[PDB]
Design a protein around this ligand. Structure first.
Ligand SMILES: Cc1cc2nc3c(=O)[nH]c(=O)nc-3n(C[C@H](O)[C@H](O)[C@H](O)COP(=O)(O)OP(=O)(O)OC[C@H]3O[C@@H](n4cnc5c(N)ncnc54)[C@H](O)[C@@H]3O)c2cc1C
Ligand SMILES: Cc1cc2nc3c(=O)[nH]c(=O)nc-3n(C[C@H](O)[C@H](O)[C@H](O)COP(=O)(O)OP(=O)(O)OC[C@H]3O[C@@H](n4cnc5c(N)ncnc54)[C@H](O)[C@@H]3O)c2cc1C
Lengths: 400, 400
């Protein structure tokens, strides 16, 4: 940890990182460069309560645990020179650094077949994106979602609640193909279908003409707005140009180190080891952004601290479904705890591999999720009849 | 480049690297740690002329362009401490380093279903492996090859020439699924079948009993020896233990830098950018080991030198087939230059992507291969009728 510290990006990973630097006792300069001209804010509300209620002053991040930080908002870092240890800014200034931290996140993938569309086509990543989409969620209008991911499904639920007709086109046979158990994905489709979403599986968009989207089965879907949500691409251009190892994401180890000395990376922009799979992956979650930011900062201030070691998890709020998913989507066994039903949905899934818990899901059961995450953390091998047995107190198991 | 230099591994990548350090003018200490108690040697002969003729003094690497190097042969590096800048050796000694270079290669994957086999089961990586296999290539004996890769096919050809019966089990529908055009793979199967190889596609080994191998179609293949060749796994254990970013291979950038300052990696052990695909891959070729070693050394001595930038290629010698393959196996177009025939085989394939050459293959035509590699290097977009037209002088095109 060499002063001064410069962080590129002012999202959750950056804020979490700089707050932890201060909390851990680093007192040198910290400067954060953020391209959005917005008080730093959290993204999960954008497809949830913000999309529904519109108050950005409810979604700001707390920068108070990060005192003495200069935030350069509305400024783009255009390049860095890792030999000279400088960053070039879009406003004409240059920042020196002792330690540079790349926390530039990821951007929605564009859909090539809708390039040159002459109807509204949006993606949902930023506060600006959310305001734009919300401005078009007119009651009785028609929205088409492209993609099977959670964000689009959250938007679908929000739109249905607002009286918007919703169709959805998914290239795969199931929703939430990324990091979600099939049992959950199947149930989620049943839920959305019951709420009036017109779901089209194993279909791809081939183009659009005069307000109508074309599909690869030779059919058409008319819509007033398309929201594309087919995933994101790491914002790793500065790293690539500067000679760091990257491949849709900046490769980092558990200390957040890139292949360039004195340059670290955090959050959505990184490709990193998933300890459960033992494979490198680009993790796309709120918990990773916060936890990785904190762990990297902690180890920078105190090199005796362990590297980042938290296991993955996320949540999604889709209408009546409060979904929580931890670890791996599958193993060699799933245990279903409770009944899977559209009538007052409430259930828990546990994924095991040779008796060891490797993942869990809770739908409308936050109380189960925390002890399951602890059991997951230590690779617990509990009695499987009991795991299924409704009589079982999971918090007790975790404590033991 | 901080002295002293320590290199772990004494294969081609290591030898190429240390020779280039010396040629570029570095005069500080160089120590190489090699676990094999063998004068450094090249691997391609092991499934080719060595397997056929057995003289190891024809396969040694030239270490003369690497003067003043201490080679610690028959010694295993057990760990390194990147803070203390030391390496712990199996003989009880410790080496200090200013710059550490990991060139530890890769080892054959074991076949889980043949663990506990009570018949000879070998892999083919080392001089020791080759001598062991050769000692069992008795005329009229039966050899089973598991895997569709080039090394097993080279062994198959060598064995057939020696009068050994050969069967081969391939899990995929084609041979050489890795980095070989389908047109080449199909022809190669026809060639081996014509030479008496018993080829079994889309079959996997499920086990073995009393000298007989079991397949997933419920059938059996008796053999006197099994040689498993289903690929290799990077020898990245020291890197993993020391906290470097790895995933079946040590991630490096074009300068050979790992995520740990002062630690570099080269050769088969690395996962690195393929410039043609723009994706990270573990390259498994002789040309990469030599070229990457040279480029990394050059840039260490002269930081103004470019990073590693060579495009991939390899060759394979399979009986009457002298195969050369460069670049990508496929694009959006293949041009076939010549006829594809078992009667005096000689042809060239060119792979294009939107008119740009992205790969090439020559079978028994070394003269075509060099100019094609040059056209590939600059992403040439030549006239495609001419590329197909037999009248065409490719060397002239390259020069122009
Ligand atoms: C709509 C939506 C809903 C979500 N819901 C959930 C959820 O319920 N649960 C969950 O687990 N996760 C959710 N996520 C995911 C989560 O929010 C992300 O994982 C998180 O935002 C990643 O934080 P980050 O700081 O790494 O990246 P970002 O939030 O993308 O922040 C990076 C910032 O850096 C900026 N930047 C990029 N390049 C430059 C540059 N050259 N110069 C200056 N600035 C630059 C970016 O524009 C951006 O402002 C959601 C995301 C979205 C978009
Ligand atoms: C049979 C065979 C045929 C081949 N034919 C061809 C061909 O025709 N064309 C082609 O393009 N490529 C071919 N190859 C591939 C090629 O030879 C490899 O790409 C090349 O050997 C890689 O070189 P390397 O130095 O990175 O690794 P290696 O050659 O594997 O050298 C690494 C060395 O480091 C040692 N080591 C590992 N760990 C330690 C440790 N902890 N301490 C000390 N030493 C350690 C290893 O045991 C090994 O001796 C062939 C390979 C084989 C095995």
């Amino acid at each position: 940890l060499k002063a001064p510290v410069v962080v590129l990006g002012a999202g959750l990973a950056s804020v979490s990182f700089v707050a932890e630097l201060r909390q851990a006792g680093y007192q040198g300069l910290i400067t954060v460069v953020g391209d959005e001209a917005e008080r730093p804010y959290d993204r999960p509300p954008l497809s949830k309560d913000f999309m529904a209620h519109g108050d950005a002053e409810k979604i700001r991040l707390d920068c108070k645990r990060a005192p003495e930080v200069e935030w350069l908002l509305g400024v783009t870092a255009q390049s860095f020179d890792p030999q000279a240890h400088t960053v070039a800014l879009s406003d004409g200034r240059t920042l020196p650094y002792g330690t540079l931290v790349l926390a530039t996140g990821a951007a929605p993938r564009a859909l090539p077949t809708l390039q040159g569309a002459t109807m509204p086509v949006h993606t949902l990543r930023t506060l600006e994106d959310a305001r734009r989409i919300q401005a078009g969620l007119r009651p009785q209008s028609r929205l088409l979602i492209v993609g099977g991911g959670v964000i689009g499904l959250e938007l679908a639920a929000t739109a249905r609640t607002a009286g918007v007709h919703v169709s959805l086109v998914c290239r795969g046979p199931r929703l939430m193909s990324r990091a979600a158990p099939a049992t959950l994905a199947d149930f989620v489709a049943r839920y959305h279908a019951a709420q009036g979403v017109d779901l089209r599986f194993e279909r791809s968009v081939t183009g659009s003409v005069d307000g109508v989207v074309l599909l690869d089965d030779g059919t058409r879907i008319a819509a007033d707005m398309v929201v594309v949500g087919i995933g994101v691409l790491a914002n790793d251009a500065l790293a690539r140009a500067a000679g760091l190892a990257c491949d849709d994401g900046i490769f980092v180890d558990a200390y957040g180190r890139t292949t360039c000395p004195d340059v670290y990376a955090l959050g959505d922009v990184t490709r990193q080891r998933n300890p459960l799979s033992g494979r490198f992956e680009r993790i796309e979650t709120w918990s990773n952004a916060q936890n990785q930011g904190i762990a990297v900062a902690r180890h920078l201030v105190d090199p005796t601290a362990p590297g980042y070691a938290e296991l993955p998890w996320y949540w999604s709020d889709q209408g009546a479904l409060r979904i929580q998913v931890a670890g791996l989507a599958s193993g060699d066994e799933e245990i279903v705890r409770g009944e899977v039903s559209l009538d007052a949905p409430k259930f828990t899934l546990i994924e095991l591999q040779k008796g060891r818990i490797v993942g869990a899901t809770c739908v409308n059961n936050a109380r189960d999720f925390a002890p399951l995450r602890r059991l997951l953390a230590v690779g617990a091998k509990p009695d499987r009849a009991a795991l299924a047995d409704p009589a079982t107190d999971l918090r007790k198991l975790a404590a033991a």
